[model samples]
Target: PKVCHLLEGEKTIDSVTSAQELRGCTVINGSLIINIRGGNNLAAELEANLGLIEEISGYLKIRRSYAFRKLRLIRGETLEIGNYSFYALDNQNLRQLWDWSKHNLTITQGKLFFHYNPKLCLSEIHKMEEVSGTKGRQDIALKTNGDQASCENELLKFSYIRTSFDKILLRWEPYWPPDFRDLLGFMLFYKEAPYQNVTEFDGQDACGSNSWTVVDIDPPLRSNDPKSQNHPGWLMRGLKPWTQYAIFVKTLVTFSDERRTYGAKSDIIYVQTDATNPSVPLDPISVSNSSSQIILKWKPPSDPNGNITHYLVFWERQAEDSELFELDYCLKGSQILKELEESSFRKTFEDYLHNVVFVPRPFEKVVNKESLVISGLRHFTGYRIELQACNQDERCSVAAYVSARTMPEAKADDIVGPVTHEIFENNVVHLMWQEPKNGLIVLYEVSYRRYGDEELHLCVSRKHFALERGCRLRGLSPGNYSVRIRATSLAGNGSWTEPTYFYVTD
Candidate 1:
């Protein structure tokens, strides 16, 4: 049967880079599993993991291996195993110290201790073992509060990496979200060469290493015959005798912002016929800041069918080329690896061999935002703002960028006040305010707090909000509270704010 699964590090329909992605996977276990790596508290981590797993089980079964499980431990907590530093005497006071560790497991008794030097490996055995010692045959115990803590019964799974000649292969199959037909296309890379292409047969557009194509699949048909099934899966036979490639099906047709639209390429699926196939790498790659632009230059495709010579730079805000076809280069009759890399090789045909230049484009200019300033940004006063980037075609695509305001200046005429607040009928004691006068009105910022909390959640408006006046807080719980405000301004463009305080009744 043709089946698709969502896996960790899998790219979404949205973009190309994996760092900006949320890694997750869906398996036949009937649930979606999300892996959260790195050091984390055993109990809390277990709870959070199980919680997400249950949330995913609403649609599929969830399964995980036991080896990756982690447990929390606290100081002074003794265990039935290895020797530990149990010299610290008080339990309650030790609880305080252990709280500082915030681990799921804590040593309460026994000589149970940890070697903080090399840190324990989480993917390995995580429990304490028993031992007979010189002091005595003591049992080691790890405690959270006062009891043996239990972990949530859920697990996170990911693809294991495989090493090959000069590179490693990481593979995973996804239980693609059910009936999600919007997948336009996908790409598979193996250190740049010996890859497969599927654009023409997939009935899609062409894609590069950093992009994908969009294509429509025949509505998935239920078929017992292996030759004509209409579902998305890996095509393994034509590329290498034993390697498999990751494949994804595109479902939605997207349009680019008119200003950034590039012209259309062919509408056929293309994959490598074998190791001898030749294709062009993507180009004109660029980057920019708030002010200027960066340009890139590169060498052309190594081997063409002698059909086209000059390379035309293509730029689109969306993945139009990828949708045009499958781009696995391995199936082509060439020895070059399908994935594009920083190096190139030469091949001999008939009586002549040629050298191909594999050059990556250059990194250009860096634009600084601080170099530009608004004409009249008053001293201490708070102000909001909104900004945008023009698409390649010079039109707005979707709303993709966001940021809040920076700190205020220290001048009386430049003061700004809070922009949002909540009020509860019973908790009025936290109310506060300040008086603005003349140019000094822009010199201060009004602020308030619930007693003892360090984080300041309320602030003057950011650039994304509409311009308006007096900040009124509405959400409040019944209590006595304190409020404060400060002033800042620019004489020689200096910055600082003086603090004011008041009390309120709920």
Candidate 2:
């Protein structure tokens, strides 16, 4: 199985004449000197035999090969060149060195000398410099011929900032040489968290199996011709929320022959988006209750995912088992509702409670000694209350519901005779009602419904309750609607008035 030497020696093959002698050899224990001087088809001959050679324990020297246009080797993950240099010298027609970089070729104790190859790509030579650096070798001399006009310098520093929940702003400064004016743009590479061990050789590779996602700077970095003190910046978007990421940038340039070249990689940067939602408010409790108000208190959420913006206080009366409410009939008619406890019906209660309007205020402006007083509540009413902590990200979490009942009020007479007036020009309906001539007035509930719709809507307001005159309703469509009103005092809610109809005009 040992086609070449097992002991120390050298193998000199005349690539033009003795190419068939090394046909099936896999490993060469010594140096391989392919002397192809004045050979016409040496490129094809070496392509046939070089594929079988996996390890060259010595040098790989191809000298004075005038007809060799390319060096293509297959089936080698790494080419081990031990103690002796890789010298491809004076190959006049060798335009490409294929599969050299594709394999992990290590020159452990020798230099890589590629000189006098006039047609070799300068970009490829620069890539070889990186390859040498990766192999921990210090001696790499690529000189004297190929396209030297296309050389580019590396980028030194790169940093990024997460500007928003889904956006990242990148900035970089070039460390290019002053004379290197062939700069074109930059290539940006990024990936999600937990990097994998896979090589990314080019920009068009897939990011799924390969770990890096590559993109070119579309609008190119700005010019410093006018001497502005601004560096290059790029905005990256469409990123996942609250996720980690890594990014790096590489400088790009174009040669006169339209060949693109890349420089060394810049420093990598890590960033994470701030798109997490804040936690729910904690342990809400009804602190006290008066005849027309309830005072509630709660601790702030333990895990404030971000900065706390505000707290929303919502309250509504729990549906009572009486003729004044329909929720009691609906809940008792459904067997599912009857089997579940009050605590387990949080979602159902929240759905109904949110239908009642409540104004939101900033936490600092509303909280007094970690408690808030909700006034204008009707007397003898069982109320369901909840609190929500919100953040700047437009995310909020609701706390557990709490229940409390206000004390019953003194005796009072019921209000009556609700009427509606139409404002044709404004397309509005103004409702007016007779006030009860009795105890202190607390609030009024205005009930309205569109004509031909079975659902009824309710709105409670304390603004005009004390005056007991009229309230204007805006933003109504040009259609027939009905309105009714019920008055609440220190006592309780009286009977709702008969449905009064009005028309909105254009």
Candidate 3:
């Protein structure tokens, strides 16, 4: 029969010290080691127990090395590294770690989460929460107070064991004995400075010792109630565009033993204004033509902001020479002669008398002159004219020019043919006639005498169209009428055509 030994102990397996006395048990270098019979019957049990021992050893080793692997979780305090400060958790809830991977890190349900990660860093978590729109960390600073400082100390108490290879996953647990969640009312800090020291190791050397300052934890005291709960300054309309701005907000609660305050600040925000206003018009006016007595027309600049005013018309004789001509060649001779002309026909020059500004009738009425005849025109000369509308405090429009010819010499014997008449049912008379031997006819004057009236009614003069041979006379009374046609040529010569008589009836 083979002798058998039982390896059983009532106490925990780790506390068994009498195993060294067993004769068959192996003692390697004064160390007690368990032994098992090498056989297929106990293979499964042996493998299971071996795996359990290995797992237990790993746990013990991790516990022993806690100090070396732990990460320090701090409060508002920042630990500067190389041009950067290592960040811990915020003061919101002490147990939850800040998710630095996300632009926004939230603490709720005893856990912290992050969202939006472009450039991952330990310091950008709190900065993202402060600014509202597209907020990111560029140039900024951090500050702290006593509570925040202590919270930072608590964070430093634990060393990080491992960082996920993907850089998106990280795990940390406290190594110190004391609980970290107890600290509250920590100071949160930020600055809009162009540059900031990042790492705690070189903060003093890079950012200077004075660059860091403690943030004020206490909210500003309200001595008086706000005049308006909905302040107009806080209204949406009052919001101003900002290229860059920093805002610090805090929420406070008062209690008997503790007054807790949680605050956040924004990074520098960039803003700009791109809208532009309308453009303005230049000088404009009208003037008398030197070659011809005709009024010249011109247009001034059309401003983008407002309407164009009177255009500054330039007028100078071909014979006149002066620097004023160079300034405004149109008004070289008449510098002070600023006149308001209509914008109509601003594109071209019209007869001085036909110009909207000097409509001969208005000039007679305005100056009380004895019919200001626009005279002294040469037959075949090109004359420049400009006219512009009168805008507020502005002058005329652009100046335009045209060449006009005077009437040629008339022939006395050039006679037109007999006239033909048609009386409409409405008592209007339509007179028709043939053109005279001359190719050009400027105007036709019609004269008529009523059957019973002694005064001869001179019918309105009619202008001849280039190729037409008739005129319609309206507003006539029922009566017998004798009508005559006189043709005036461009040379100012007049020839009377044979007369035609007709009866008008209603």
Poorly placed runs, candidate 1 (over 4 Å) = 1-278, 282-286, 289-292, 304-310, 314-447, 450-506
Clash number by candidate, in order: 149, 0, 64
**Candidates 2 and 3, the one with greater TM-score:** 2
Best-performing candidate as measured by TM-score: 2
Q: TM-score of model 3 relative to the true fold?
A: 0.19
Each prediction's RMSD to truth: 33.9, 28.2, 35.7
User: Which predicted model would earn the best lDDT?
Assistant: 2
Candidates sorted by lDDT, best first? 2, 3, 1
* Tens-place lDDT digits, model 1, residues 1-506: 21233354121221212212322321122212222222223233333333222112112111111111122222222222243332221122111111112223333334533222111221111232211121342421233222211111222122433433223333333222222322223333221222554222221111222323322333343466766544333323223312333333322222222422111122222222222223443232222221212122333333432222222222222122332233322132422223111111111231143233444561111122211233232222222322222211232212212221223433433334542334545543332333434222222344555567442434432111113233455555434444554433222222223443333444
Per-residue CA lDDT of candidate 2, range 352-437, in tens?
78866665771223433457787777666777877777766356775557898877654444665557564746676667777766
Whole-model lDDT per candidate: 0.28, 0.60, 0.32
